[PDB]
Design a protein around this nucleic acid. Sequence first.
RNA 1: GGGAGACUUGAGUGCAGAAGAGGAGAGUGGAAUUCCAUGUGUAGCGGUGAAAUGCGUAGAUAUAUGGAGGAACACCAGUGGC
Length: 116
Amino acid sequence: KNIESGVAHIHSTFNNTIVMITDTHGNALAWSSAGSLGFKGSKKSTPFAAQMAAEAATKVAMEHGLKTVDVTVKGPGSGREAAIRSLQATGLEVTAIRDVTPVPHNGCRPPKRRRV
RNA sequence: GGGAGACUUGAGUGCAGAAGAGGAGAGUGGAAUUCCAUGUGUAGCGGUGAAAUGCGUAGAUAUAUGGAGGAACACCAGUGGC
């Protein structure tokens, strides 16, 4: 329950952001998202929704007990900045940041465009 | 134009060097996806102009450690090269 620090996994996309706080070896400690907060439609894709997600997840995580986190960013979208600022505000000192945006190295065929 | 020649500039051979996703055969790789397994954790995930179909409480998404399988080769990479 009570631990020292973990990680911040922030899977931001065009439709939703999903914040997940985990221990350094992996086993999770909290998570939340815009739909969890109660957002709908395009509101899920918002920095405010990412902010509220980080708020709720940090509240639960601090209720368990911790102080600081590393930040593992992944994906497009603009919730990154607002969510990180809200981590700082709700208390978790942002130890460090790194993006792990997967580079396919030309690995897979992506689907067609949204026309033709 | 025909025939008998002669010559080396054209064409080619030889000496020595240069470059190169040039081609065929063989194997090998790291990244990423998908799936499978093990844990964490639990209510939404995904998607849209809006939604909805779908998937998910039988443990989803996500997260961390491996494994299987296929395909394509980030940077270099450029009206650059063959």
